[PDB]
């Protein structure tokens, strides 16, 4: 997902009101221990309550009180003595809600030389009226951007603030020789509503983990649940088309050959709208199948017969020639029309929709639906993986996932003649299990 | 001998089924798990076993044998066997004959196509031999017994002409090979004549193809009580579930959806359960065919009253919707 | 020859047997199902069914004993009836299983304790001898059979005319070697001397289609 | 009544499911039309008096 970059460097002095929103993803890259804290609330002000949690040097302070708050808060260490100088977070307090501070120790606070050193990891989250404060620990050395990786991070705090955090505010260190800056970075990402599929070792310890909609790979994984998957066709969760429009007959317009949720006088539903040659007498309002479903609608407006098709629904499933030999898979839309399911991907219009997903102009329509990601060769091999009315697919060399149409055996031939026969002259033999 | 060896293979959506695009019927199925995982993982076992059993049956030999031009093999007249290249069918006269006489949900129609959904979740998936695969294999099978015998199966195919292999198969069954030679024109008669009283039997009449049909018409009822279903109201306000919302506050609102659910999600476990032990009949026929395909077809068999009754000499598969059909020749005494 | 190709053929096995999978594929399917049979039944423990929680204990605690008895019986039936499908779906299994062990049971008395004429029962090939072997929850049958090899053509004819009389063969044909006629068999090219030994005297010449004239010793 | 209705839907004919045991087979059926053989339909009870 796609993190936002911000800077302590020499004229950059990041520290806005950020949006927290759901919670979010705090990292940041020290060598001089710029970050020190975050200022979490709503209005910023001392009209209500918000809560300051800052390593001041000597210890950690946790604070939820009515806090005059500065629209420039910081830290600052004079670079010629490197020593921690001020403290200007908040000028005065009071209505305190809550109060922590950590064991005391001693802080590194003094410009360094070379490159980044420490990576912190802070994950904050609201929920109960609890700050959750996640924390983790990764060595680097680097002079840019956040590094790719997977570390756990572990729970150090759970703070009964009572406050309403929808915005937050980090607090830098201002270096200065009248201030300044120094070498750090600070990342912010959001946190989403989501399904991981954690893997525990014997000791306890999340050593891996998978994003369940990131794409049709990792959605088959959290299926089976398994990080390796053998060769095969697998079934997985059913598609859906979501309706875009809204014909009604107030009155608006009538939409066609759209997948539109309707509501014409008694009659409410989604679906699709297209005209028809029914013919209706003159007293029939609307009409049903040989089922008890509503399947066609008398216009009430202008006495056009029209039909109502269901939006679209099916299966879902992932071919694949196995997490051994690669990562590539293809999908079957099941029972579907590929014009339906191109366009609804394009608009963004499925449920489920996966994250690092394309079409890959590989289309192909079979009986047994939409077949998308696989080549069409026209030849004909050993069927490898049934998908249905004659066709299989393959991993071959062209290695892609090819579709092609099965071969039935060896085309051989035997000569008829009245007068010969053929009579073997050797023998073998052979053990079957 | 008519033998059916696969089923119709469905599937069912039960978003589509039980609440029917209901948003407030899609929160309440939550609670009662994954129970749509598991109708899905039960009802996809059962149409990839319809699969296992139509290769088991058909796809016995190797090698695609390919028909010969000359049809009349010594006096015995094939024509009505093997598939005729004159007319566009790729079936053979009997087959044409087969597939006239065993002749809602969710389908695709047409070839390589018009693919139409209903309103509630049911569907019907193609199988994976299409008719023309089943027809070549069969085709393969007669063309490979009238010039190899034995051997076609048991091994590689030997090149022996027709009359030597009858009268191979007259001398197992205990009569001597001379009855053969000496009597060659009755015997090319009587088997000339013996099919085309079967190619009448199916023009004229009917019931002769009634195990085929009855695998088709039950799969039609259990859809159509599943179908009907829908319509019941359980002791609820009303099986509609708009009505329900309409009429009613969001607290008798969710009681009278979840009374809803709970009736329409054990009709639909009984419906897997049902079909689960008709698959368990539709095995048991279809690996009594693979047995007289390879013992009968590819062979000869000693064992009375299997393979027709009187002393078995050949024998010819057919296809047919959903099954085999076995034309089996056997000797007389009188 | 005959052990030679005996011996290698089991060396064959056992070799398929360390390096590859998926022989075994079926003897694990058993397994496989009864795993996920038991994991659903588990899995209907956390869910719900509509009630207040998944846990009596949360039940009785949060709830009044009049509506305790509504919540806790309506997980009853939740529980009750995903048992009764366990049991439901164990007995049509079952009776898969019988269907196999008793096919398994006609393989290893028509099979290992005989010889069978069945052709595509016990393997492919002319069936000489079997042997049965363990495995988990299930048996190996490994299947000797004899596969004929090395075709020639030859010229063939139904009778010999030498007489006047019509003979035909009492086992076998006639085949034309290139340069004088045999008798041989069908299944191994062993040409003998066609004498009136093995040769059926029956109706006279110009009767049967394709009569050779030759000599009968 | 059981009622069928033609491709234009129109009422071509009509079936009394009350009128006598051949009728109640017809609308228990759903056919117009019924092969020979014997057919299971609808329970009696005896009222009492
Ligand atoms: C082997 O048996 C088949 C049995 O079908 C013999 O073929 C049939 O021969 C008759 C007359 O020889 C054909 O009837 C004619 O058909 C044409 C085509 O429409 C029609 O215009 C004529 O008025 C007449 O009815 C019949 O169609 C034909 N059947 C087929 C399938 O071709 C065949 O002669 C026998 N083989 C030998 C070598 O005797
Ligand atoms: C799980 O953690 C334990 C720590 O208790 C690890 O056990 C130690 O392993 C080392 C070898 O690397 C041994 O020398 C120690 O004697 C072990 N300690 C104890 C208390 O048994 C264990 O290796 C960890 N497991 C994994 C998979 O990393
Ligand atoms: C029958 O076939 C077998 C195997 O195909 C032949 O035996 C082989 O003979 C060669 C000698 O040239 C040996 O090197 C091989 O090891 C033998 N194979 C086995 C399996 O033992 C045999 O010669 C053939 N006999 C005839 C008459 O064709
Ligand atoms: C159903 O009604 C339609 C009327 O629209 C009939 O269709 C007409 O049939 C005549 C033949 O009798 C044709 O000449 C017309 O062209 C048709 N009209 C249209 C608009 O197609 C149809 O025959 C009726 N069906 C039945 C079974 O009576
Ligand atoms: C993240 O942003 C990049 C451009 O900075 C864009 O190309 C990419 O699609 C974005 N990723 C997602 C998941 O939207
Ligand atoms: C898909 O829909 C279009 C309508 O725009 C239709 O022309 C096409 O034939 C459909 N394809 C199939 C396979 O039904
Ligand atoms: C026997 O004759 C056929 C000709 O129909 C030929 O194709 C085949 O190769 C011959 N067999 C041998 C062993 O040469
Ligand atoms: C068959 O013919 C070959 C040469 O044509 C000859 O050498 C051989 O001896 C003959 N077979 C017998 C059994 O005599
Ligand atoms: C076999 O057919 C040939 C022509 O291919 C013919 O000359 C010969 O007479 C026939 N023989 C028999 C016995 O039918
Ligand atoms: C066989 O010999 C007889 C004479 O004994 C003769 O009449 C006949 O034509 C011969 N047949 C052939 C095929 O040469």
Same mark, same amino acid.
């Given at each position: 997902?796609?993190?936002?970059?911000?800077?302590?460097?020499?004229?950059?002095?990041?520290?806005?009101?950020?949006?927290?929103?759901?919670?979010?993803?705090?990292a940041?890259?020290?060598?001089?221990?710029?970050?020190?804290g975050?200022?979490?609330?709503?209005?910023?002000?001392?009209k209500?309550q918000?809560?300051?949690?800052?390593?001041?040097?000597?210890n950690?302070?946790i604070?939820?009180?009515?806090?005059?708050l500065?629209?420039?808060?910081?830290?600052?260490?004079?670079?010629?003595?490197?020593?921690?100088?001020?403290?200007?977070?908040?000028?005065?307090?009071?209505?305190?809600?809550?109060?922590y501070i950590?064991?005391?120790?001693?802080?590194?606070?003094?410009?360094?030389?070379?490159?980044?050193?420490?990576?912190?990891?802070?994950?904050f989250?609201?929920?109960?009226?609890?700050?959750?404060?996640?924390?983790?620990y990764?060595?680097?050395?680097?002079?840019?951007?956040?590094?790719?990786?997977?570390?756990?991070?572990?729970?150090?705090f759970?703070?009964?603030?009572?406050?309403?955090?929808?915005?937050?505010?980090?607090?830098?260190?201002?270096?200065?020789?009248?201030?300044?800056?120094?070498?750090?970075?600070?990342?912010?990402?959001?946190?989403?509503?989501?399904?991981?599929?954690?893997?525990?070792?014997?000791?306890?310890?999340?050593?891996?983990?998978?994003?369940?909609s990131?794409?049709?790979?990792?959605?088959?994984?959290?299926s089976?649940?398994?990080?390796?998957?053998?060769?095969?066709?697998?079934?997985?969760?059913?598609?859906?088309?979501?309706?875009?429009?809204?014909?009604?007959?107030?009155?608006?317009?009538?939409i066609?050959?759209?997948?539109?949720?309707?509501?014409?006088?008694?009659?409410?539903?989604?679906?699709?709208?297209?005209?028809?040659?029914?013919?209706?007498?003159?007293?029939?309002?609307?009409?049903?199948?040989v089922?008890?479903?509503?399947?066609?609608?008398?216009?009430?407006?202008?006495?056009?017969?029209?039909?109502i098709?269901?939006?679209?629904?099916?299966?879902?499933?992932?071919?694949?020639?196995?997490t051994?030999?690669?990562?590539?898979?293809?999908?079957?839309?099941?029972?579907?029309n590929?014009?339906?399911?191109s366009?609804?991907?394009?608009?963004?219009?499925?449920?489920?929709?996966?994250?690092?997903?394309?079409?890959?102009?590989?289309?192909?329509?079979?009986?047994?639906?939409?077949?998308?990601?696989?080549?069409?060769?026209?030849?004909?091999?050993?069927?490898?993986?049934?998908?249905?009315?004659?066709?299989?697919?393959?991993?071959?060399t062209?290695?892609?996932?090819?579709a092609?149409?099965?071969?039935?055996?060896?085309?051989?031939?035997?000569?008829?003649?009245?007068?010969?026969?053929?009579?073997?002259?050797n023998?073998?033999?052979?053990?079957?299990? | 001998?008519?033998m059916?060896?696969?089923?119709?293979? =469905?599937?069912?959506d039960?978003?589509?089924?039980?609440?029917?695009?209901?948003?407030?019927?899609?929160?309440?199925?939550?609670?009662?798990?994954?129970?749509?995982?598991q109708?899905?993982?039960?009802?996809?076992?059962i149409?990839?076993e319809?699969?296992?059993?139509?290769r088991?049956?058909?796809?016995?030999?190797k090698?695609?044998?390919?028909?010969?031009?000359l049809?009349?093999?010594?006096?015995?007249?094939?024509?009505?066997?093997?598939?005729?290249?004159?007319?566009?069918?790729?079936?053979?006269?009997?087959?044409?004959?087969?597939?006239?006489?065993? =002749?809602?949900?969710?389908?695709?129609?047409?070839?390589?196509?018009?693919?139409?959904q209903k309103?509630?979740?049911?569907?019907?998936?193609?199988?994976?031999?299409?008719?023309?695969?089943?027809?070549?294999?069969?085709?393969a099978l007669?063309?490979?017994?009238?010039?190899?015998?034995?051997?076609?199966?048991?091994?590689?195919?030997?090149?022996?002409?027709?009359?030597?292999?009858?009268?191979?198969?007259?001398?197992?069954?205990?009569?001597?090979?001379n009855?053969?030679?000496?009597?060659?024109?009755?015997?090319?008669?009587?088997?000339?004549?013996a099919?085309?009283?079967?190619?009448?039997?199916?023009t004229? =009449?009917?019931?002769?193809?009634?195990?085929?049909?009855?695998?088709?018409?039950?799969?039609?009822?259990?859809?159509?009580?599943?179908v009907?279903?829908?319509?019941?109201?359980?002791?609820?306000?009303?099986?509609?579930?708009?009505?329900?919302?309409?009429?009613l506050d969001?607290?008798?609102?969710?009681?009278?959806?979840?009374?809803?659910?709970?009736?329409?999600?054990?009709?639909?476990?009984?419906?897997?359960?049902?079909?689960?032990?008709?698959?368990?009949?539709?095995?048991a026929?279809a690996?009594?065919?693979?047995?007289?395909?390879?013992?009968?077809?590819?062979?000869?068999?000693?064992?009375?009253?299997?393979?027709?009754?009187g002393?078995?000499?050949?024998?010819?598969?057919?296809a047919?919707?959903?099954?085999?059909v076995?034309?089996?020749?056997?000797?007389?005494?009188? | 020859?005959?052990?030679?190709?005996?011996?290698?053929?089991?060396?064959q096995?056992?070799?398929?047997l360390?390096?590859?999978s998926?022989?075994?594929?079926? #003897?694990?399917?058993?397994?496989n199902?009864?795993?996920?049979?038991?994991?659903?039944?588990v899995?209907?423990?956390?869910?719900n069914?509509?009630?207040?929680?998944?846990?009596?204990?949360?039940?009785?605690?949060?709830?009044?004993?009049?509506?305790?008895?509504?919540?806790?019986?309506?997980?009853?039936?939740?529980?009750?009836?995903? #048992?009764?499908?366990?049991?439901?779906?164990?007995?049509?299994?079952?009776?898969?299983?019988?269907?196999?062990?008793?096919?398994?049971?006609?393989?290893?008395?028509?099979?290992?304790?005989?010889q069978?004429?069945?052709?595509?029962?016990?393997?492919?090939?002319?069936?000489?001898?079997?042997f049965?072997?363990?495995?988990?929850?299930?048996?190996?049958?490994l299947?000797?059979?004899?596969?004929?090899?090395?075709?020639?053509?030859?010229?063939?004819?139904?009778?010999?005319?030498?007489?006047?009389?019509a003979?035909?063969?009492?086992?076998?044909?006639?085949?034309?070697?290139?340069?004088?006629?045999?008798?041989?068999?069908?299944?191994?090219?062993?040409?003998?001397?066609?004498?009136?030994?093995?040769?059926?005297?029956?109706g006279?010449?110009?009767?049967?289609?394709?009569?050779?004239?030759?000599?009968?010793?």
């Amino acid at each position: 997902s796609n993190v936002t970059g911000f800077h302590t460097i020499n004229h950059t002095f990041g520290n806005p009101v950020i949006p927290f929103k759901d919670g979010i993803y705090f990292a940041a890259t020290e060598k001089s221990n710029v970050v020190r804290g975050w200022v979490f609330g709503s209005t910023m002000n001392n009209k209500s309550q918000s809560v300051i949690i800052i390593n001041n040097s000597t210890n950690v302070v946790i604070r939820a009180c009515n806090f005059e708050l500065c629209d420039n808060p910081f830290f600052a260490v004079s670079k010629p003595m490197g020593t921690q100088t001020h403290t200007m977070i908040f000028d005065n307090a009071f209505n305190c809600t809550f109060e922590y501070i950590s064991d005391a120790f001693s802080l590194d606070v003094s410009e360094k030389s070379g490159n980044f050193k420490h990576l912190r990891e802070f994950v904050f989250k609201n929920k109960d009226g609890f700050l959750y404060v996640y924390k983790g620990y990764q060595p680097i050395d680097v002079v840019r951007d956040l590094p790719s990786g997977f570390n756990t991070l572990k729970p150090i705090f759970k703070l009964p603030l009572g406050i309403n955090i929808t915005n937050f505010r980090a607090i830098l260190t201002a270096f200065s020789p009248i201030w300044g800056t120094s070498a750090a970075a600070y990342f912010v990402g959001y946190l989403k509503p989501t399904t991981f599929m954690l893997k525990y070792d014997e000791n306890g310890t999340i050593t891996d983990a998978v994003d369940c909609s990131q794409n049709p790979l990792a959605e088959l994984k959290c299926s089976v649940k398994s990080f390796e998957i053998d060769k095969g066709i697998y079934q997985t969760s059913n598609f859906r088309v979501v309706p875009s429009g809204d014909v009604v007959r107030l009155s608006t317009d009538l939409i066609k050959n759209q997948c539109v949720n309707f509501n014409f006088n008694g009659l409410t539903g989604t679906g699709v709208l297209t005209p028809s040659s029914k013919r209706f007498q003159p007293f029939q309002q609307f009409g049903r199948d040989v089922s008890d479903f509503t399947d066609s609608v008398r216009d009430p407006k202008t006495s056009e017969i029209l039909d109502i098709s269901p939006c679209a629904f099916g299966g879902v499933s992932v071919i694949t020639p196995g997490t051994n030999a690669s990562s590539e898979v293809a999908v079957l839309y099941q029972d579907v029309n590929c014009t339906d399911v191109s366009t609804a991907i394009h608009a963004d219009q499925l449920t489920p929709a996966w994250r690092i997903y394309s079409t890959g102009n590989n289309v192909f329509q079979t009986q047994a639906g939409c077949l998308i990601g696989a080549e069409h060769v026209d030849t004909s091999y050993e069927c490898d993986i049934p998908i249905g009315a004659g066709i299989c697919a393959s991993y071959h060399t062209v290695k892609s996932i090819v579709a092609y149409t099965m071969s039935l055996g060896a085309d051989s031939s035997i000569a008829y003649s009245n007068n010969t026969i053929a009579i073997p002259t050797n023998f073998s033999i052979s053990i079957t299990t | 001998e008519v033998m059916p060896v696969s089923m119709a293979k =469905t599937s069912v959506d039960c978003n589509m089924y039980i609440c029917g695009d209901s948003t407030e019927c899609a929160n309440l199925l939550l609670q009662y798990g994954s129970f749509c995982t598991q109708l899905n993982r039960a009802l996809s076992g059962i149409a990839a076993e319809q699969d296992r059993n139509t290769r088991e049956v058909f796809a016995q030999v190797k090698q695609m044998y390919k028909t010969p031009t000359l049809k009349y093999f010594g006096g015995f007249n094939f024509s009505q066997i093997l598939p005729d290249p004159l007319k566009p069918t790729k079936r053979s006269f009997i087959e044409d004959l087969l597939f006239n006489k065993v =002749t809602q949900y969710g389908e695709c129609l047409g070839d390589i196509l018009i693919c139409a959904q209903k309103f509630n979740g049911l569907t019907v998936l193609p199988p994976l031999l299409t008719d023309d695969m089943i027809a070549a294999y069969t085709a393969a099978l007669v063309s490979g017994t009238a010039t190899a015998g034995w051997t076609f199966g048991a091994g590689a195919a030997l090149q022996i002409p027709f009359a030597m292999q009858m009268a191979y198969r007259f001398n197992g069954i205990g009569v001597t090979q001379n009855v053969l030679y000496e009597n060659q024109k009755q015997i090319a008669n009587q088997f000339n004549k013996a099919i085309s009283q079967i190619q009448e039997s199916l023009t004229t =009449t009917s019931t002769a193809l009634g195990k085929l049909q009855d695998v088709v018409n039950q799969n039609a009822q259990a859809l159509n009580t599943l179908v009907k279903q829908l319509s019941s109201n359980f002791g609820a306000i009303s099986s509609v579930l708009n009505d329900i919302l309409s009429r009613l506050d969001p607290p008798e609102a969710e009681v009278q959806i979840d009374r809803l659910i709970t009736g329409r999600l054990q009709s639909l476990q009984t419906y897997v359960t049902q079909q689960l032990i008709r698959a368990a009949e539709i095995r048991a026929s279809a690996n009594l065919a693979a047995t007289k395909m390879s013992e009968c077809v590819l062979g000869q068999s000693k064992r009375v009253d299997f393979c027709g009754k009187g002393y078995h000499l050949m024998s010819f598969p057919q296809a047919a919707p959903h099954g085999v059909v076995f034309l089996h020749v056997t000797y007389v005494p009188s | 020859q005959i052990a030679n190709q005996f011996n290698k053929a089991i060396s064959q096995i056992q070799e398929s047997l360390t390096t590859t999978s998926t022989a075994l594929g079926k #003897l694990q399917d058993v397994v496989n199902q009864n795993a996920q049979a038991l994991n659903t039944l588990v899995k209907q423990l956390s869910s719900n069914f509509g009630a207040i929680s998944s846990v009596l204990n949360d039940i009785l605690s949060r709830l009044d004993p009049p509506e305790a008895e509504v919540q806790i019986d309506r997980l009853i039936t939740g529980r009750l009836q995903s #048992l009764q499908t366990y049991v439901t779906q164990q007995l049509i299994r079952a009776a898969e299983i019988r269907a196999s062990a008793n096919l398994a049971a006609t393989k290893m008395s028509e099979c290992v304790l005989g010889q069978s004429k069945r052709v595509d029962f016990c393997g492919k090939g002319y069936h000489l001898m079997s042997f049965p072997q363990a495995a988990p929850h299930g048996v190996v049958f490994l299947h000797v059979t004899y596969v004929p090899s090395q075709e020639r053509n030859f010229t063939t004819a139904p009778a010999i005319c030498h007489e006047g009389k019509a003979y035909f063969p009492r086992e076998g044909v006639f085949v034309f070697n290139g340069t004088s006629w045999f008798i041989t068999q069908r299944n191994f090219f062993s040409p003998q001397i066609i004498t009136t030994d093995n040769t059926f005297v029956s109706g006279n010449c110009d009767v049967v289609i394709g009569i050779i004239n030759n000599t009968v010793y």
